[PDB]
CSV table of N, CA, C and O in Angstrom, one decimal:
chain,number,residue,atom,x,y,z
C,1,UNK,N,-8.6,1.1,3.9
C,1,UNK,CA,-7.5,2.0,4.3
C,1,UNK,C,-7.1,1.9,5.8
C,1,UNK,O,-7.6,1.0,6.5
C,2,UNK,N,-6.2,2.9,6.3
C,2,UNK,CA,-5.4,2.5,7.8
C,2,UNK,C,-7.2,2.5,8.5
C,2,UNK,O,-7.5,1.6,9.4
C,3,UNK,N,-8.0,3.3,8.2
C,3,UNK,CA,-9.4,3.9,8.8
C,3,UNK,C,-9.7,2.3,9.1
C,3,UNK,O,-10.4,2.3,10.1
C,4,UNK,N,-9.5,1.1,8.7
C,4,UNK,CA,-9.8,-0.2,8.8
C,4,UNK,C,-9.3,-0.7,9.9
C,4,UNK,O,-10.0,-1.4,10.6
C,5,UNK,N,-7.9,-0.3,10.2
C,5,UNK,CA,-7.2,-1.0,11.2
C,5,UNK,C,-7.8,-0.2,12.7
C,5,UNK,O,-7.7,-0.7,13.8
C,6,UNK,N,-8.4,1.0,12.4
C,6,UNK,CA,-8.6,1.8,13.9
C,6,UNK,C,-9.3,0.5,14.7
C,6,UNK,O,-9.1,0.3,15.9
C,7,UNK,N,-9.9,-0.2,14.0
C,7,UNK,CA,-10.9,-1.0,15.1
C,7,UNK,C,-11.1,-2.6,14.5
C,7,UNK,O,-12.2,-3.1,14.3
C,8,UNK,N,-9.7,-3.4,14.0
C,8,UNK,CA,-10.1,-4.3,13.7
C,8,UNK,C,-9.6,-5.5,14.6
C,8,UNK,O,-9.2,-5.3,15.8
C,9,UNK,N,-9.6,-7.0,13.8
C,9,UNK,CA,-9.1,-8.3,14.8
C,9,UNK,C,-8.3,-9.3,14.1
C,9,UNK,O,-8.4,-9.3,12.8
C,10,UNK,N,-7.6,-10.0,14.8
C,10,UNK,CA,-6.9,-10.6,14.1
C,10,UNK,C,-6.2,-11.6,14.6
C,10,UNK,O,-5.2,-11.4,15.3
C,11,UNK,N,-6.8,-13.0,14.3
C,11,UNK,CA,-6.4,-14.4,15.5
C,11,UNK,C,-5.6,-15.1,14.5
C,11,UNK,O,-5.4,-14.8,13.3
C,12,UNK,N,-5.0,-16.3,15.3
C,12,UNK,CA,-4.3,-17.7,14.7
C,12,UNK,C,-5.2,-18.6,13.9
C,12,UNK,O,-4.9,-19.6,13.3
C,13,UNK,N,-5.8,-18.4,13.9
C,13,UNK,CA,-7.3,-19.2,13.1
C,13,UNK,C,-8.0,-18.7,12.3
C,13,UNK,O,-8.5,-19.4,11.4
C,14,UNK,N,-8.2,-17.1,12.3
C,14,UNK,CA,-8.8,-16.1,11.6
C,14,UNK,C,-8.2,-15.3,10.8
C,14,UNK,O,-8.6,-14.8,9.7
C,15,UNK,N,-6.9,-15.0,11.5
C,15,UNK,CA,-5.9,-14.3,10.5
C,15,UNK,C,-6.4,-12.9,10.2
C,15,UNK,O,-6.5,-12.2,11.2
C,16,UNK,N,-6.7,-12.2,8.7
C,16,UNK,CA,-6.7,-11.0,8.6
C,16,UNK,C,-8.1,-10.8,7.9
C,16,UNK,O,-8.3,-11.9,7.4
C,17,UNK,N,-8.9,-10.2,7.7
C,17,UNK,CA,-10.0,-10.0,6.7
C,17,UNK,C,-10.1,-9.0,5.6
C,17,UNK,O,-10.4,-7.9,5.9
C,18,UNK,N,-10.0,-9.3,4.7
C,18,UNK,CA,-10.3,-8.6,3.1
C,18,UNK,C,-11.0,-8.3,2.2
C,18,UNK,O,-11.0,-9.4,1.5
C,19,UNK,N,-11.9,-7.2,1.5
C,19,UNK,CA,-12.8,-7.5,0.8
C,19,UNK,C,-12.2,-8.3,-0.6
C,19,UNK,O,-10.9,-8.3,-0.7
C,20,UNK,N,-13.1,-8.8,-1.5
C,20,UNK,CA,-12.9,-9.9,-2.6
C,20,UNK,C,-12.4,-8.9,-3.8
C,20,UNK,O,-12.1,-9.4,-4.9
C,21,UNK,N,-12.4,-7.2,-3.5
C,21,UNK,CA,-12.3,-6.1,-4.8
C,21,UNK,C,-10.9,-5.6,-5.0
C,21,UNK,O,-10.5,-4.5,-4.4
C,22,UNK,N,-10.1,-6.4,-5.8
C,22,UNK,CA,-8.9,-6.4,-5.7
C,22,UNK,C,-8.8,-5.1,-6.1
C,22,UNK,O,-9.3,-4.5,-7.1
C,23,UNK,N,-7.7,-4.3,-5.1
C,23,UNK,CA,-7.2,-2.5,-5.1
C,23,UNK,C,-6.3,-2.7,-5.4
C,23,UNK,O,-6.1,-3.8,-4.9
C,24,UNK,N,-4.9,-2.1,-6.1
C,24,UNK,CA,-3.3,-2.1,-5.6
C,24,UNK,C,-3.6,-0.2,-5.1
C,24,UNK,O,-4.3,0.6,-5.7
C,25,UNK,N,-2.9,-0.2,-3.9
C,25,UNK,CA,-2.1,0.8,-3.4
C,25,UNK,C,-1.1,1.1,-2.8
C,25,UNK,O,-0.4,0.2,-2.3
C,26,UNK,N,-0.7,2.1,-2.8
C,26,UNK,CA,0.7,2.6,-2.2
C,26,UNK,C,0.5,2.8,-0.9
C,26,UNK,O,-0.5,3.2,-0.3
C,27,UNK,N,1.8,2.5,-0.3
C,27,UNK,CA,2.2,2.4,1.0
C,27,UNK,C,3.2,3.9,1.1
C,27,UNK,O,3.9,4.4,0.2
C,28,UNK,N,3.0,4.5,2.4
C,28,UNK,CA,3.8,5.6,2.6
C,28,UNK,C,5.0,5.3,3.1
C,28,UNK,O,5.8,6.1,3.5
C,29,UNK,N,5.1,3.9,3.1
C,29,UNK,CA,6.7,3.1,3.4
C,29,UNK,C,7.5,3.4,2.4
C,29,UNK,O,8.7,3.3,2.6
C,30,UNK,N,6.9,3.8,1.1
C,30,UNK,CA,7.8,3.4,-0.3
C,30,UNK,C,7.2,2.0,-0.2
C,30,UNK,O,8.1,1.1,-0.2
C,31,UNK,N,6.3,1.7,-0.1
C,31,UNK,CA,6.0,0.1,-0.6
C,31,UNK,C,4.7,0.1,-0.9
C,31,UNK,O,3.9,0.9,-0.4
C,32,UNK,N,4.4,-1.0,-1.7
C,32,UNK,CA,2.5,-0.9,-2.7
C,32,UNK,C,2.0,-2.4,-2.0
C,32,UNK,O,2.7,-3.3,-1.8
C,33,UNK,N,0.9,-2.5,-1.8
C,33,UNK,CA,0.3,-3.0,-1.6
C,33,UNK,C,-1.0,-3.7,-2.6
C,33,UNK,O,-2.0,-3.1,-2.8
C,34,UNK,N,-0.8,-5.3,-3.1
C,34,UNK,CA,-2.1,-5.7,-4.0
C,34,UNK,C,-3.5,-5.2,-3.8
C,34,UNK,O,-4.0,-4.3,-4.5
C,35,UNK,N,-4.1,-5.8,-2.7
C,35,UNK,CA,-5.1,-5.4,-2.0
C,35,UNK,C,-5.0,-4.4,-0.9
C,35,UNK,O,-4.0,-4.2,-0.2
C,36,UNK,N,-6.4,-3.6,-1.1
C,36,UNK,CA,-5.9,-2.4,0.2
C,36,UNK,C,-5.8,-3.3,1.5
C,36,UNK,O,-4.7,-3.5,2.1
C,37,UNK,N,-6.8,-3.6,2.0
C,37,UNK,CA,-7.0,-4.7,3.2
C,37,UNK,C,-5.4,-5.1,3.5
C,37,UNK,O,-4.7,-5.2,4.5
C,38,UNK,N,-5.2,-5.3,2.2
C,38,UNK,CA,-3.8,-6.3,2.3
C,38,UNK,C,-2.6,-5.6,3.2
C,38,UNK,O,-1.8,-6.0,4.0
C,39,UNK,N,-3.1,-4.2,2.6
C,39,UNK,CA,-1.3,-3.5,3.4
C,39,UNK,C,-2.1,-3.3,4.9
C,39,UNK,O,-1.2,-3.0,5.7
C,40,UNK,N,-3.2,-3.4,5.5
C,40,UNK,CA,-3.2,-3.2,7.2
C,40,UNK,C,-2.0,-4.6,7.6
C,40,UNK,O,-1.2,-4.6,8.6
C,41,UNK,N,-2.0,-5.7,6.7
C,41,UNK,CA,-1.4,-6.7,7.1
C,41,UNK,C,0.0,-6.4,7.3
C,41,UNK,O,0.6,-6.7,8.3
C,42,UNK,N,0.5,-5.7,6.1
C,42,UNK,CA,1.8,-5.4,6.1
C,42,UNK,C,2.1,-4.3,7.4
C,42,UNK,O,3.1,-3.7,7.5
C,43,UNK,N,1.2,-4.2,8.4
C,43,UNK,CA,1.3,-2.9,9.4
C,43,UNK,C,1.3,-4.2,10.4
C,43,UNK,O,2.1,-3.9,11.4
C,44,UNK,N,0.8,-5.5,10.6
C,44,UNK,CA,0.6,-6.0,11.5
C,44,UNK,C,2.1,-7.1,12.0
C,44,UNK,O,2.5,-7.6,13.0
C,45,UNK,N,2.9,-7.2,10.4
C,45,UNK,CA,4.1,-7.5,10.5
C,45,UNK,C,5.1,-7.3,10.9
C,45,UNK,O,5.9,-8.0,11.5
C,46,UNK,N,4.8,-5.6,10.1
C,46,UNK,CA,6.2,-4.8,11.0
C,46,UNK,C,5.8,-3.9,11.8
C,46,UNK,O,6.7,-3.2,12.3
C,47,UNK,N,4.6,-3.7,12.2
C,47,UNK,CA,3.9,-3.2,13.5
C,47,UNK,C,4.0,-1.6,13.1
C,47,UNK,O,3.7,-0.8,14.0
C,48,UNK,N,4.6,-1.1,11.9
C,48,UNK,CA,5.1,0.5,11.7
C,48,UNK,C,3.8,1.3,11.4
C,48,UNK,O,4.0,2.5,11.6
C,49,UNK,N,2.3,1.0,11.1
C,49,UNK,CA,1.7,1.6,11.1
C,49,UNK,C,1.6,2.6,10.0
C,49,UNK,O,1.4,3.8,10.1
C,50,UNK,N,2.0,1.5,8.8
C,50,UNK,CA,1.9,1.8,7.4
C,50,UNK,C,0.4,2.3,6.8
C,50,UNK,O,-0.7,1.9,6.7
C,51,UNK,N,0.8,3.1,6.7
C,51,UNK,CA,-1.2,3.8,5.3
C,51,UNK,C,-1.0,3.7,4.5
C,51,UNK,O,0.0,3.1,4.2
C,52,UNK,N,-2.0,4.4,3.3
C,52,UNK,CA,-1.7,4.2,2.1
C,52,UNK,C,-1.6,5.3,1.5
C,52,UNK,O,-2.4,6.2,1.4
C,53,UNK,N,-0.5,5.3,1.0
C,53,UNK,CA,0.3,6.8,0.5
C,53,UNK,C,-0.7,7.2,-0.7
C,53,UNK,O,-1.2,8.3,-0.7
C,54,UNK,N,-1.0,6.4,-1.6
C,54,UNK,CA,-2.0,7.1,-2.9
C,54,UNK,C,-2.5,6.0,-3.0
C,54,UNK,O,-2.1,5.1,-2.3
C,55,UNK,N,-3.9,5.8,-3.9
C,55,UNK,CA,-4.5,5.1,-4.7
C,55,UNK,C,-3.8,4.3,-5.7
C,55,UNK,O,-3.0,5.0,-6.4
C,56,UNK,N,-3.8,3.2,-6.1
C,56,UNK,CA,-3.2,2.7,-7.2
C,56,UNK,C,-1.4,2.3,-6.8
C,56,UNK,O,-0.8,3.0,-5.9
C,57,UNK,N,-0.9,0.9,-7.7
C,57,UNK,CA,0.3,1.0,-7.2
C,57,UNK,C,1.3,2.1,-6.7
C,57,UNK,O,0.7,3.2,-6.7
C,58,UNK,N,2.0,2.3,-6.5
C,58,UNK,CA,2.8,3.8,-6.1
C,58,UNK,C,3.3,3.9,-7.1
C,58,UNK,O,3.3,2.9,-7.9
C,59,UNK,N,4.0,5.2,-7.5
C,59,UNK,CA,4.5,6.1,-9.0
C,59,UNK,C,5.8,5.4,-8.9
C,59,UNK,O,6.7,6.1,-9.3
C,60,UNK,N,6.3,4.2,-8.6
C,60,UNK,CA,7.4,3.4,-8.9
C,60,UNK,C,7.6,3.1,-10.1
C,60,UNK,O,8.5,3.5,-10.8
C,61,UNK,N,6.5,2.2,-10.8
C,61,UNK,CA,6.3,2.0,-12.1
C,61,UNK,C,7.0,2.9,-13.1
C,61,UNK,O,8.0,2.7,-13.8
C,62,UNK,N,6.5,3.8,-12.9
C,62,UNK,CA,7.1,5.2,-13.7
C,62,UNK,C,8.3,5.5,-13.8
C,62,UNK,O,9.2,5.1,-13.1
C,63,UNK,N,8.5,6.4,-14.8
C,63,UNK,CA,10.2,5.8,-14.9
C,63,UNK,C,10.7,6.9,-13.9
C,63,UNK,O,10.2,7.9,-13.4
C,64,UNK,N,11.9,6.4,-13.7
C,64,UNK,CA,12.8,7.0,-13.1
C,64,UNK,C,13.0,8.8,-12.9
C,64,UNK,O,13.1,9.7,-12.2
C,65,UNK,N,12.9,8.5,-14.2
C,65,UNK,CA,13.1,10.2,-14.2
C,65,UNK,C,12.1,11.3,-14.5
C,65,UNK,O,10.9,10.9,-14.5
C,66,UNK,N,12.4,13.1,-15.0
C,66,UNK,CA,11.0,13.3,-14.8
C,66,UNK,C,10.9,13.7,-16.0
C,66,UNK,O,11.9,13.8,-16.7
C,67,UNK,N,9.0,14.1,-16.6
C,67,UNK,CA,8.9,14.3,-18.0
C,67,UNK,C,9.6,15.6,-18.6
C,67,UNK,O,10.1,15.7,-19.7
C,68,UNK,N,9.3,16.5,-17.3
C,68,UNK,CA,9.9,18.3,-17.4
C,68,UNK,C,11.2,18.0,-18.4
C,68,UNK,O,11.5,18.9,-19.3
C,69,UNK,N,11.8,16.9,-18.3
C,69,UNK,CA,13.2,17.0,-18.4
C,69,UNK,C,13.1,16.6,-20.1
C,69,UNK,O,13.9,16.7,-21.0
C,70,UNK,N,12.0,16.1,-20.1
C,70,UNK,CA,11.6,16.0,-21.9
C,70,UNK,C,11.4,17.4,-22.6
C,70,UNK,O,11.7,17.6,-23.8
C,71,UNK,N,10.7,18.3,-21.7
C,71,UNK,CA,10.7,19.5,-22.4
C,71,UNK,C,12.3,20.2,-23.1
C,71,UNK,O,12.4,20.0,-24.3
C,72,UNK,N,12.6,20.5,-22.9
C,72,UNK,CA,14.0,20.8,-23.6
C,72,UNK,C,14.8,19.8,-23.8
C,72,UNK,O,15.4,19.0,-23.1
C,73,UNK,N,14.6,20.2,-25.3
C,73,UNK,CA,15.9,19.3,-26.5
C,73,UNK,C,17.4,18.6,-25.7
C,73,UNK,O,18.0,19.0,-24.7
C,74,UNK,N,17.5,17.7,-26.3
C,74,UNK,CA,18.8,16.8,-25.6
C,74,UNK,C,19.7,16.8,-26.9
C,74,UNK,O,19.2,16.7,-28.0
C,75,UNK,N,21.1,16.9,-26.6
C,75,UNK,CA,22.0,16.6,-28.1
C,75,UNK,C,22.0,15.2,-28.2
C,75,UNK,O,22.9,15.0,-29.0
C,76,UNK,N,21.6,14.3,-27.9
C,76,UNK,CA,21.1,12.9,-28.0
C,76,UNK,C,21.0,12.2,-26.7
C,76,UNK,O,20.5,11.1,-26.6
């Protein structure tokens, strides 16, 4: 998580470090990330100081709209 980036390093040779336990998470960008490790990268990019909005890819997946709207009947 960002808790990673408070105190991490990151050279031309070394690049970025990640554990091998592939996570997908959400980004509070509106953007998901494969690996968690992976989105500090996406912060080192665009320097915005992206976290991880939830566990698991973000509720993009999901459809568009919402279930409530399934509770009452549609005329088709």
């Amino acid at each position: 998580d960002s808790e990673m980036c408070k105190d991490y390093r990151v050279l031309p040779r070394i690049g970025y470090l990640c554990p091998k336990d592939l996570k997908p998470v959400c980004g509070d960008d509106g953007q998901t990330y494969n690996n968690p490790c992976m989105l500090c990268h996406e912060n080192l990019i665009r320097q915005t100081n992206t976290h991880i909005r939830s566990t698991g890819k973000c509720e993009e997946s999901s459809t568009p709209g919402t279930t409530a709207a399934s509770m009452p009947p549609s005329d088709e």
